Structure formats: C-alpha cells, structure tokens
Amino acid sequence: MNKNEQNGDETKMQSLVGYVVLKDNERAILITDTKAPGKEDYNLSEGQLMNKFKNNIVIVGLSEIDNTDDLKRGEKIKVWFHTRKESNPPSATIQKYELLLEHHHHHH
C-alpha cells in the first residue's frame, strides 16, 4: 500500500469520526455523535440545527485544508484535530482528515 498503516506516528493527531451535515469552504458543521439527522434536519437552517444537535455538534475549521472539494456533506468522515476552540458549541481546527463512506469504511 501507499497508505502506510496509521500506527506508530510521532505526531499523534486526535481523530474523531463524525457526520458531515453542513459544509462551507473554510468551515464545516459536523455531528461527532452517532445519530444521523433526519430529512427535515437537512432542510433546517444552520443555526436551528446547531441549537438542536448542540449537545454533540462540532464546527471544524477547514482553513488548513485546501482540498475541501472531496469533502461530502450528507456523509461521514474521520477528522484529525489538535487545536480546538471550545465555545459551546465547540469548534475544532483540522489540518487533515480522512473521508469515509456509507458503503465502505476502510477508505481507499
């Protein structure tokens, strides 16, 4: 493989698996929990969704990532963060992420 197993890294980044529900360019709104939103939740306003899933909602900073076009909203991802701003709802600055899929978890 060209993707050497992520195991034995010096810089251990904190990986969190969550759902991408809302997506912009420099930022994305993720659910760090395992409950996926409903049809209407994807039709709600950002703030309304934020107030609703406030318990486990995290806004990630995509400013460090200049390829957010592979980031799919309505999907699931695995993000690596370290620098975070806990404001309630909390925000996490991610410099690297790993895209997941409903069909297959072990991303190619």
- We report the CATH number of the domain holding residue 72 as 2.40.50.140
Those residues with Cβ within 8 angstroms of residue 105's Cβ, 6 or more apart along the chain or in another chain: none
- Asked, for residue 7, whether it belongs to a domain, the answer is no
Q: Is 70 helix (H, G, I), strand (E, B) or coil?
A: helix
Residue 64 is classified by DSSP as T
List the one residue out of 53, 80, 75, 52 whose CA is nearest residue 65.
80
List the one residue out of 90, 37, 51 whose CA is nearest residue 79.
90
- Asked, for residue 8, whether it belongs to a domain, the answer is no
Dihedral over Cα of 53, 23, 68, 103: its sign:
positive
d(CA 17, CA 76) in angstroms, rounded, equals 7
Length reported for the chain: 108
- Asked, for residue 45, whether it belongs to a domain, the answer is yes
For residues 92 and 81, is the Cβ–Cβ distance under 8 A? yes
- Asked, for residue 36, whether it belongs to a domain, the answer is yes
Can you say how many angstroms the Cα of residue 14 is from the centroid of all Cα atoms in its chain? 12
74 C-beta neighbours (distance < 10 Å), count: 13
Number of compact structural domains in the chain: 1
List the one residue out of 19, 41, 37, 34 whose CA is nearest residue 97.
19
Block residue for tokens 């701003």: 85
For residues 43 and 15, is the Cβ–Cβ distance under 8 A? no
Block residue for tokens 């934020």: 50
For residues 59 and 86, is the Cβ–Cβ distance under 8 A? no
